[PDB]
Amino acid sequence: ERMYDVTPPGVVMGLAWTAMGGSTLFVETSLRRPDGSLEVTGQLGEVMKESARIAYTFARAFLMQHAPANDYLVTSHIHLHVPEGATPKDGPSAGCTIVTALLSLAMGRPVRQNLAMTGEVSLTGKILPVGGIKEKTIAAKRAGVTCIVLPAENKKDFYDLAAFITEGLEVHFVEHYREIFDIAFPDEQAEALAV
Numbered sequence: 801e802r803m804y805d806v807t808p809p810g811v812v813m814g815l816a817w818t819a820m821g822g823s824t825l826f827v828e829t830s831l832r833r834p835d836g837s838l839e840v841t842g843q844l845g846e847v848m849k850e851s852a853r854i855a856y857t858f859a860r861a862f863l864m865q866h867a868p869a870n871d872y873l874v875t876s877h878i879h880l881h882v883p884e885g886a887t888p889k890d891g892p893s894a895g896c897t898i899v900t901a902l903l904s905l906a907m908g909r910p911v912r913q914n915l916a917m918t919g920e921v922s923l924t925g926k927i928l929p930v931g932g933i934k935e936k937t938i939a940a941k942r943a944g945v946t947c948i949v950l951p952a953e954n955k956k957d958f959y960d961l962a963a964f965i966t967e968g969l970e971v972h973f974v975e976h977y978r979e980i981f982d983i984a985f986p987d988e989q990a991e992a993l994a995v
């Protein structure tokens with residue numbers, strides 16, 4: 801089972817691993833009040849806290865180019881949480897997940913359902929390779945993930961898995977956050993008609 805079968809805005813599924821295997825986790829974000837700020841909870845280590853700062857800065861910049869009239873990330877007091885509360889978590893691979901959670905919250909739009917992602921985020925939005933792709937992918941498949949987004953340089957790790965694991969997985973290998981944004985929010989890049 802999963803902690804969220806259906807993600808509302810501000811909630812994105814990420815992927816973690818330990819020496820004991822892989823798991824899914826959800827990044828949760830929310831307002832704490834009507835210059836902004838980010839408060840972060842979830843027993844995060846120092847690499848993960850820094851990846852939340854990087855993601856926060858990039859998301860502010862990304863959404864000032866995609867939606868300059870939208871100030872929600874610049875002015876709001878945001879809270880970011882990664883359950884479960886007692887479990888320690890660390891590492892950079894949730895960067896894109898955090899970016900997506902913040903944009904999802906600021907746009908008031910949920911991300912594509914049954915989607916998980918992992919990837920380190922650069923300050924300019926480059927997606928850097930991560931560890932545990934095999935364990936994270938198995939965990940996604942067990943959790944009902946149908947769409948998985950991974951750093952492009954982790955492609956060989958993904959295809960080291962047996963076919964019966966990756967069959968049925970729609971996989972996207974990405975290098976810049978813009979590619980994730982268009983998978984996560986397909987209606988922001990979809991064919992439209994005027995009336």
Ligand SMILES: *[B]([O])([O])[C]([C][C]([C])[C])[N]C(=O)[C]([C]C1=[C][C]=[C][C]=[C]1)[N]C(=O)C1=N[C]=[C]N=[C]1
Pocket residue numbers: 814815816817818819825845848888889890891892893894930931932
């Ligand atoms: B990602 O690989 O950076 C990811 C980020 C986020 C999903 C937590 N981090 C991990 O998957 C961590 C989880 C963790 C758990 C407890 C304490 C620290 C980190 N795992 C690893 O970094 C890791 N797992 C197995 C073997 N080596 C390292």
